[PDB]
Symmetry: C2
């Protein structure tokens, strides 16, 4: 019958491994080129007559 | 006597004007490529025996 096939594999190349850099919540923040702060916001106002 | 000399001047070239971009406290923050946050800090600990 149909069984799960698994192809033979060569050792892992270090260049394929990106995972060490984003496996934790903090790391996902370390990963942003820039973090969002309150002073970056500009709120629009529609002033009336 | 010695009086303050002032050389004749040509109109201002727009390319010389950088001042419009950092004349206010907020602008000096807008000017940073990256702002400092608490999550960017890593504190070293010397653990004893």
């Amino acid at each position: 019958m149909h069984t799960a096939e698994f192809l033979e594999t060569e050792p892992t190349e270090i260049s394929s491994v990106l995972a060490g850099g984003y496996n934790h919540p903090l790391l996902r923040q370390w990963q942003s080129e820039r973090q969002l702060t309150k002073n970056m916001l500009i709120f629009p106002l529609f002033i009336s007559d």
